[PDB]
Amino acid sequence: NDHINLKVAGQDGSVVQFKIKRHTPLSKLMKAYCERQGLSMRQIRFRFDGQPINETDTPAQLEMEDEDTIDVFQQQ
Amino acid sequence: GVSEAELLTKTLPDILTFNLDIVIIGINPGLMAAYKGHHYPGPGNHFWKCLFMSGLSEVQLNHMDDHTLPGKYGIGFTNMVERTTPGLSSKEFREGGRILVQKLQKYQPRIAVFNGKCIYEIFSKEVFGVKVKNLEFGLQPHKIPDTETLCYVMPSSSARCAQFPRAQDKVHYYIKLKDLRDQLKGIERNMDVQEVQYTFDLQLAQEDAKKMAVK
């Protein structure tokens, strides 16, 4: 349950890098992202490896590695 | 009726007390800030939004809440130049710096947060004498003379700031300030999700800033 870095890249050219434990639910990362970006979680969708990220997935469960990148889209 | 003495120039009182964790320092309060009687009124400034998106405030606060900050959040406000005149002297900055340093040496907050490189560049030359070569945002290698007060610099919260067009482009500095604040008080926050870095593309950021504006 070590730490790994994950980047979240949006369509506005920004990239936010987070450090997170392998067994921490990604829901926490997604919420932190929305809060710091001042975005509502309702109009945002996160994807990794072309697959939607559900609220219970963890980096470990998704076999994510250090420095992997998550895609985020604003459903506006 | 009887008596017409309403003057144009108006002064926004500082919000300072002893034992504060943070003191937000600006160059000079805007005209509306002075007339409204509160710090960083909207629109056109990202301070209050950044305060919330960084987690420094529990809920989204606004200028009307500035007087509750010292007690609830350990945050205060002050400026280089005290008087706000409608529509920049060298002497003012000189006499201003002396008075500012004096207020800091008096109240001695844990952290002096400079709102914008400009204010710090002026302050640095007048107090430290140094001209600051290649200034970096964040914690500086100087404490306020005769105090244990740290100096922290972040981009200007004004929407006019061109280097960082959006509030989101400034939030990372507020997050790191929260971190510093926590470490100083011995508050052990959770290290489950840590924001290591924020990177942005200027062109897209300013375009995006414009779009958000028209809307």
**DSSP code, position B140:** E
Whether residue B171 lies within 8 A of chain A, CB to CB, comes out as: yes
Q: Supply B43's token pair.
A: 């629109």
Q: What is the largest CA-CA distance in chain B?
A: 65
CA A65 vs CA A28, A32, A47, A58: distances in Å: 18, 20, 15, 12
Number of Cβ within 10 Å of residue B38's Cβ equals 19
Q: With CB atoms and an 8 Å threshold, state whether B201 touches A20.
A: no
The technique is X-ray
> Counting Cβ atoms within 10 Å, is residue B1 exposed (0-12), middle (13-18) or buried (19+)?
exposed
Q: Where are the alpha helices (DSSP H) in A1-76?
A: 26-37
CA B32 to chain centre: 17
- Give the domain range for residue B201: 1-215
Q: How, if at all, do strands B83-84 and B22-26 pair?
A: unpaired
**Closest C-alpha to B29, from B65, B76, B82, B89:** B82
B2 phi, psi to nearest 5 deg: -45, 110
Q: What is the CATH number of the domain that holds B98?
A: 3.40.470.10
Number of Cβ within 10 Å of residue B33's Cβ equals 22
Q: Considering only residues 46 to 105 of chain B, which have any Cβ-Cβ distance to chain A shorter than 8 Å?
A: 49, 52-55
How far is the C-alpha of B116 from the C-alpha of A8, rounded, in Å?
27
Q: Residues of B with catalytic annotation?
A: 28, 39
Q: Considering only residues 97 to 116 of chain B, which have any Cβ-Cβ distance to chain A shorter than 8 Å?
A: none
Resolution (Å units): 2.1
Name, in order, each residue with C-beta under 8 angstroms of B22's C-beta and a sequence gap of 6 or more. B74, B75, B76, B109, B110, B111, B113, B177, B181
Which residue in the set B54, B55, B200 is minimally distant from A14, CB to CB? B200
Total domains in chain B come to: 1
Q: How, if at all, do strands B150-154 and B138-143 pair?
A: antiparallel
Whether B76 and B14 have beta carbons less than 8 Å apart is answered as: yes
Does the N-terminal peptide bond of residue B155 adopt cis geometry, omega within 30 degrees of 0?
no
SS3 state of residue B32? helix
Handedness of CA B99, B105, B106, B110 (dihedral sign): positive
How far is the C-alpha of B70 from the C-alpha of B24, rounded, in Å?
11
Name, in order, each residue with C-beta under 8 angstroms of A42's C-beta and a sequence gap of 6 or more. none
Chain B residues in contact with A18 by the CB 8 A cut-off are: 193-196
How far is the C-alpha of A41 from the C-alpha of A55, rounded, in Å?
11
**Closest C-alpha to B52, from B161, B147, B178, B144:** B178
CA A4 to chain centre: 12
**Closest C-alpha to A15, from A72, A75, A74:** A72
Burial A28-62 (b: 16+ CB within 10 A, else e): bbbebbbebbbbeeeebebebeeeebeeebbbeeb
Domain A1-76 fold: Ubiquitin-like (UB roll) (3.10.20)
Whether residue B195 lies within 8 A of chain A, CB to CB, comes out as: yes
How far is the C-alpha of B178 from the C-alpha of B56, rounded, in Å?
6
Edge to edge, the sheet with strand B111-115 lists B75-79, B22-26, B111-115, B150-154, B138-143
